[PDB]
Swiss-Prot record, chain A:
Main localization category: cytoplasm
Modified residue annotations for N-acetylmethionine: 1
GO MF, one annotated term: structural constituent of ribosome
Family according to the record: Belongs to the eukaryotic ribosomal protein eS21 family.
Subunit relationships: Component of the 40S small ribosomal subunit.
Organism annotation: Homo sapiens
Cross-link (Glycyl lysine isopeptide (Lys-Gly) (interchain with G-Cter in SUMO2)): 41
Protein name: Small ribosomal subunit protein eS21
Swiss-Prot record, chain C:
Gene3D superfamilies: Ribosomal protein S26e (3.30.1740.20)
UniProt modified residues of type Phosphoserine: 53
Basic and acidic residues composition-biased segments: 86-96
Higher taxonomy: Eukaryota, Metazoa, Chordata, Craniata, Vertebrata
Keyword NADP: no
Quaternary context: Component of the 40S small ribosomal subunit.
Any Gene Ontology CC annotation: extracellular exosome
Protein name: Small ribosomal subunit protein eS26
Gene encoding the protein: RPS26
Swiss-Prot record, chain F:
Function: Component of the ribosome, a large ribonucleoprotein complex responsible for the synthesis of proteins in the cell. The small ribosomal subunit (SSU) binds messenger RNAs (mRNAs) and translates the encoded message by selecting cognate aminoacyl-transfer RNA (tRNA) molecules. The large subunit (LSU) contains the ribosomal catalytic site termed the peptidyl transferase center (PTC), which catalyzes the formation of peptide bonds, thereby polymerizing the amino acids delivered by tRNAs into a polypeptide chain.
Amino-acid biosynthesis recorded as keyword: no
Gene label: RPS2
Keywords assigned: Acetylation, Citrullination, Cytoplasm, Isopeptide bond, Nucleus, Phosphoprotein, Repeat, Ribonucleoprotein, Ribosomal protein, Ubl conjugation
Residues carrying Phosphoserine: 206
Cross-link (Glycyl lysine isopeptide (Lys-Gly) (interchain with G-Cter in SUMO1)): 217
Primary localisation category: cytoplasm
Covalent cross-link Glycyl lysine isopeptide (Lys-Gly) (interchain with G-Cter in ubiquitin), where: 217
Ribosomal protein in keyword set: yes
Superkingdom, natural source: Eukaryota
Name by which UniProt lists this protein: Small ribosomal subunit protein uS5
Family indicated by similarity: Belongs to the universal ribosomal protein uS5 family.
Modification(s) after translation: Citrullinated by PADI4 in the Arg/Gly-rich region.
Gene Ontology cellular component terms for the protein in this record: cytoplasm; cytosol; cytosolic ribosome; cytosolic small ribosomal subunit; extracellular exosome; focal adhesion; membrane; nucleoplasm
Curated annotation (Swiss-Prot), chain H:
Disease entry from the Swiss-Prot or TrEMBL record: Brachycephaly, trichomegaly, and developmental delay: An autosomal dominant developmental disorder characterized by brachycephaly, ciliary trichomegaly, dysmorphic features of the face and hands, hearing loss, and developmental delay with short stature. Intellectual disability and autism spectrum disorder may be present in some patients.
Section of the entire sequence shown: 2 to 72 of 143
Record has Ribosomal protein as a keyword: yes
Protein task: Component of the ribosome, a large ribonucleoprotein complex responsible for the synthesis of proteins in the cell. The small ribosomal subunit (SSU) binds messenger RNAs (mRNAs) and translates the encoded message by selecting cognate aminoacyl-transfer RNA (tRNA) molecules. The large subunit (LSU) contains the ribosomal catalytic site termed the peptidyl transferase center (PTC), which catalyzes the formation of peptide bonds, thereby polymerizing the amino acids delivered by tRNAs into a polypeptide chain.
Region (Disordered): 1-25
The keyword RNA-binding appears for this protein: no
Taxonomic lineage from the root: Eukaryota, Metazoa, Chordata, Craniata, Vertebrata
UniProt source species: Homo sapiens
Compositional bias segments (type: Basic residues): 1-19
Cross-link (Glycyl lysine isopeptide (Lys-Gly) (interchain with G-Cter in SUMO2)): 36
MF GO annotations: RNA binding; structural constituent of ribosome
Membership in a protein family: Belongs to the universal ribosomal protein uS12 family.
Compartments where found: Cytoplasm, Cytosol; Cytoplasm; Rough endoplasmic reticulum; Nucleus, Nucleolus
Official protein name in the record: Small ribosomal subunit protein uS12
Length: 82, 221, 102, 25, 129, 220, 134, 71
RNA sequence: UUACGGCGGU
RNA sequence: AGAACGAAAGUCGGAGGUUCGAAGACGAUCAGAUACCGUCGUAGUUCCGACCAUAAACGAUGCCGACUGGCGAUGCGGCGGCGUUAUUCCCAUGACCCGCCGGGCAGCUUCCGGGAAACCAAAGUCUUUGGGUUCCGGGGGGAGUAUGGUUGCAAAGCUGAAAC
């Protein structure tokens, strides 16, 4: 984690959420990482790549995973944009 | 859903209207005002169908992201949507949990019926909460075809259609099983998938043998 | 420990209510503690109606009623069974009991 | 013994010794 | 009855970050907080914010991001000298990698580091980390 | 001669997920006792903190159960704290280590300032409350040492941390709660967003979607 | 005082679920079956199993009790999988809607694509069932 | 709640100087009447003559006659 | 209707 | 510092005296009943006036201010409306019906969060500790007592220790 020598003396890089930005802990058992599989523009079929989203345990339990992943997606190449 | 291939496809709107699907309850939540158009004069609240279609295409963009076809645990408790939840898993290759769900199934790894999925679809969040608060532990993404009635605690891709009526549920599994194979290479978008939405609808009680063979005296008899 | 969300009584925004007195033991209670029970009992005790209606002086005679408002104290409500020891997670309701007329 | 009857029995006392003080001036 | 506008402005951001909202509304505004929030925007804990300039004390809408932990205030605006500065830094900051007690001097509003940068000390005003 | 039943343990018996560091980042529920013994085997020490005789009162005579407080750890920051009741002492204190290797957490070693070498202390000041006992772990200057009460001194020399101030508030003779209170602090070093961890976590491919091949390739 | 114990009712469910077609509604037939097919120690619990067998030979011969044996299960496909009818209960192109929902598909812009005669629903706002118990 | 402001310290130093009386140790060591109450009066040892060997029975869970004198 | 009591330490 | 109002009981004066009823007188039941129960019954319950400031005066939660979930419902206003219903064969206000907004007594819900927990949308925003300001508490007994002050016709109240 960037010591004075500059090297990585740290256990692991922790994740962060995409909505509430707080750090997902190492035992936070209600934090999901889901995938949104996009298609090609010609036919609407699965191509091989996808996109990623993480929703932490508290902000799932607070109610607004979907109010998150509608909006985060809305500005990120998923449906309507208006 | 921002495509031309993935548009509304006007055929199904004549089925979205005729099987409920804009007939909610009469009580919106605080986390579902964005999924509504207005209230009727008789208290009923309609649902701007562009909103429930853009969530339906988005949820199928979550099901295709699963690699294993035999891993999405599709579940149902209430009676409307017990016939559909079986042969939805026969049309996509899933495993169905119809009716009563044993608590201690996602997280009790000692007994026989211990199943651990990567995704689960629900009919109703409120009345079928027991897999939801058990999906609290096994950090699993959940989808639920929610009504304006239901809360939205452990849902992720909440589908805002309807869940009360028999016909309103079965279309929404038929629309989903149409779409979850059409984002795969099963139906090629122009040769339309003939499989009838009456296959999924909830079944009336036992006058069926009275009426199936009353229109079959010209087939066998 | 506090037993109830209210303090046992049905008042919030006041400081004083009507003092009334109980029915059987005459004991003074505030009006918003006491256990009411309104009684609309058919005064003839309807088993004894087909023995008076021959002796009634008409044919279609409206047999009257009797309107007695029993409002017990809480000390004699429990002893005469008109309320019951309830349970701590079936306390929190204000539903009236179901009828069962027949 | 109750506390409202511990007071009264000693309020009965604090008038008694407040009399024998006045006796012997 | 508002005995500090600084203390209740930074309280409301602190109430909203632990809820997690993207935007707040600081309901009264002054040149003592817009300079203050441009110590946590210039050092990058919060982001863009409009000032709804009204003819009385205006309103401020702050785009939160999710990096801010707690941004409280020391409501007795204590004087603190420069030798007197270090003994605060182990009382209300977590550690000496990060975090900032931000304080008004005659050279302007600064952090603790920028105040010990040149040679000036003044009244403490608040903190954020 | 050990066989599992779950996804995560079936996908480690043929050695396919390495280095526990990432099942911490995806936040899995850990299930069996043998996954944690698979990676960090022969790198624990299993010393107990208290055995107390809890008991209930019955129709005749006191059902005397027993209690085991046990902390397990490496010397590079993988501690676990178990609590278990059982009818006999030994079958509590044997089964408590299974329950102590299972609630096992990482801990982040940080710096006090002047980050000239390897990390030595907690990254900031953190708390742990468990009922009424709060343990405030404070970063320490170098060459100071573990400064605490006896029962967290047995754990702060078990998280590998060299030097860390520690204060306590409450009734700290409540040994088990003050043992779990210091565990509530050291488990949230990776829950405190330190401001040098801001840039976007590039989401890589999770082990439940990269190991779908062996999920059913050989087993099913 | 009659009610048969669980180890009768547990052992006489696996008989009826696994050997349904070898059995029927006569007692003395079923007493020789379990004589031959399951190791029973004595006579007294033997025929007491067979009493519950004939009691459920007259039960599941009519109804679908918890009898997940294949023979009835091979018949539910006539119910759930079959009845695929000739015309849908959706596609008759004769539906009725409201004047608000025709605005709802006017920004969806299928109103020019739809036939869709509209009826205003009822008027007076008599919903919201009357408050207060009596 | 408590009384904070950068001119208040009279209020704190006058609220303190009575509220220190209510524990035992500051009242028994500074009021002065507890310096008259002990027979030693600022001491730890003080001689005396023996009057009579008189014995007291110990308290509740025990039963023995503890032995005492009457200095 | 009426209905009182129970030596001390284990 | 100081002021006003303050239930019931109490004192004092004058009307008053229906009901109920401290005391007390009996009659019971009781081992013993100066008590539960019954008849009687004074002072008092009633008014006018002059007093005492004490209550589980309890929301056992100081006042003010902000911020932070929802949902049906309620009261006083105000706003906008399908309609119904009122002299009204038409209006203007009335009633019911559908909403929203402010203030208010409250409620049901919620791993917001807090807590020793009961439980609290405040006992939340508190070791990630400072919105102002007032009072008050320091193991239990001794004791709200001994004394001094002051108040009152009196009852007592206010202020209020220590030995042990
Ligand atoms: Mg008393
Ligand atoms: Zn009574």
């Amino acid at each position: 984690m960037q010591n004075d020598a500059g090297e990585f003396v740290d256990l692991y890089v922790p994740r962060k959420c995409s909505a509430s930005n707080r750090i997902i802990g190492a035992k936070d058992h209600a934090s999901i990482q889901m995938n949104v599989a996009e298609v090609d523009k010609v036919t609407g079929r699965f191509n091989g790549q996808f996109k990623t989203y993480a929703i932490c345990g508290a902000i799932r339990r607070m109610g607004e995973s979907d109010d998150s992943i509608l909006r985060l997606a809305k500005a990120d190449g998923i449906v309507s944009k208006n | 859903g921002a495509l031309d291939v993935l548009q509304m496809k006007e055929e199904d709107v004549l089925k979205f209207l005729a099987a409920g699907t804009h007939l909610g309850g009469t009580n919106l939540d605080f986390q579902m005002e964005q999924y509504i158009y207005k209230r009727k004069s008789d208290g009923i609240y309609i649902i701007n169908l562009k909103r429930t279609w853009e969530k339906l295409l988005l949820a199928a963009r979550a099901i295709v992201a699963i690699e294993n076809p035999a891993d999405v645990s599709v579940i149902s408790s209430r009676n409307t949507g017990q016939r559909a939840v079986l042969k939805f898993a026969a049309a996509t290759g899933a495993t169905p949990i119809a009716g009563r769900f044993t608590p201690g199934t996602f997280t009790n790894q000692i007994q026989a019926a211990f199943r651990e999925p990567r995704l689960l679809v629900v009919t109703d969040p409120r009345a079928d909460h027991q897999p939801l608060t058990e999906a609290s532990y096994v950090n699993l993404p959940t989808i639920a075809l929610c009504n304006t009635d239901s809360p939205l605690r452990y849902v992720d891709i909440a589908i805002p259609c309807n869940n009360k009526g028999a016909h309103s549920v079965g279309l929404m599994w038929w629309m989903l099983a149409r779409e979850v194979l059409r984002m795969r290479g099963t139906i090629s978008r122009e040769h339309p998938w003939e499989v009838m939405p009456d296959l999924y609808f909830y079944r009336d009680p036992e006058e069926i043998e009275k009426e199936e063979q009353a229109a079959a005296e010209k087939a066998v008899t | 420990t506090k037993k109830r969300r209210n303090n046992g009584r049905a008042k919030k925004g006041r400081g004083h209510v009507q003092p009334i007195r109980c029915t059987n033991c005459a004991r003074c209670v505030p009006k918003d503690k006491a256990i009411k029970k309104f009684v609309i009992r058919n005064i003839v005790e309807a088993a004894a109606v087909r023995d008076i209606s021959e002796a009634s002086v008409f044919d279609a005679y409206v047999l009257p009623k009797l309107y007695v408002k029993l409002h017990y104290c809480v000390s004699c409500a429990i002893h005469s069974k008109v309320v019951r020891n309830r349970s701590r997670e079936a306390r929190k309701d204000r539903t009236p009991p179901p009828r069962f007329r027949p | 013994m109750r506390a409202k009857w511990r007071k009264k029995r000693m309020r009965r006392l604090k008038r008694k010794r407040r009399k024998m003080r006045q006796r012997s001036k | 009855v508002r005995m500090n506008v600084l203390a209740d402005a930074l309280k409301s951001i602190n109430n909203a970050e632990k809820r997690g909202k993207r935007q707040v509304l600081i309901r009264p505004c002054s040149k003592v907080i817009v300079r203050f929030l441009t110590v946590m925007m210039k050092h990058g804990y919060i982001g863009e914010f409009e000032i709804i300039d009204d003819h009385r004390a205006g309103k401020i809408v702050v785009n939160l991001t999710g990096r801010l932990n707690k941004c409280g205030v020391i409501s007795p605006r204590f004087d603190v000298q420069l030798k007197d500065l270090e003994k605060w830094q182990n009382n209300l900051l977590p550690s000496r990698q990060f975090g900032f007690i931000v304080l008004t001097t005659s050279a302007g509003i600064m952090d603790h580091e920028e105040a010990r940068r040149k040679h000036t000390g003044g009244k403490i005003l608040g903190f954020f980390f | 001669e050990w066989m599992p039943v779950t996804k995560l343990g079936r996908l480690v018996k043929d050695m396919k997920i390495k280095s526990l560091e990432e099942i911490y980042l995806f936040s899995l529920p850990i299930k069996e006792s043998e996954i944690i013994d698979f990676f960090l085997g022969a790198s624990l020490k299993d010393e107990v903190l208290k055995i107390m005789p809890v008991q209930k009162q019955t129709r005749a005579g006191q059902r005397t159960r027993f209690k085991a407080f046990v902390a397990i750890g490496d010397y590079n920051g993988h501690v676990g704290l178990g609590v278990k009741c059982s009818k006999e002492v030994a079958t509590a204190i044997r089964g408590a280590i299974i329950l102590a290797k299972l609630s096992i957490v990482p801990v982040r070693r940080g710096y006090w300032g002047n980050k000239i070498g390897k990390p030595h202390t907690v990254p900031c000041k953190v708390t742990g409350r468990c009922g009424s006992v709060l343990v405030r772990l404070i970063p320490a200057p170098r060459g100071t040492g573990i400064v605490s009460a006896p029962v967290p001194k047995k754990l702060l020399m078990m998280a590998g941390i060299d030097d860390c101030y520690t204060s306590a508030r409450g009734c700290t003779a409540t040994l088990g709660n003050f043992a779990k209170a210091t565990f509530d602090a050291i488990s949230k070093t990776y829950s405190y967003l330190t401001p040098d961890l801001w840039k976007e976590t590039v989401f890589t491919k999770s082990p439940y979607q990269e190991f779908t091949d062996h999920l059913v390739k050989t087993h099913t | 005082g009659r009610v048969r114990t669980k180890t009768v009712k547990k052992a006489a469910r696996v008989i009826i679920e696994k050997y349904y077609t070898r059995l029927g509604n006569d007692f003395h037939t079923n007493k020789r079956v379990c004589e031959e097919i399951a190791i029973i120690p004595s006579k007294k619990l033997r025929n007491k199993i067979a009493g519950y067998v004939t009691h459920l030979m007259k039960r599941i011969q009519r109804g679908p009790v918890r009898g997940i044996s294949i023979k009835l299960q091979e018949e539910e496909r006539e119910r759930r999988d079959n009845y695929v009818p000739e015309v849908s209960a959706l596609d008759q192109e004769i539906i009725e809607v409201d004047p608000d929902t025709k605005e709802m598909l006017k920004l969806l812009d299928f109103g020019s694509l739809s036939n869709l005669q509209v009826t205003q629903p009822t008027v007076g706002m008599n919903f919201k069932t009357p408050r207060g118990p009596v | 709640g408590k009384c904070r402001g950068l001119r208040t310290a009279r209020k704190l130093r006058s609220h303190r100087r009575d509220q220190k009386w209510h524990d035992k140790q500051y009242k028994k060591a500074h009021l002065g009447t507890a310096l008259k109450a002990n027979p030693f009066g600022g001491a730890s040892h003080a001689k005396g003559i023996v009057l009579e060997k008189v014995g007291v029975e110990a308290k509740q869970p025990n039963s023995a006659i503890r032995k005492c004198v009457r200095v």
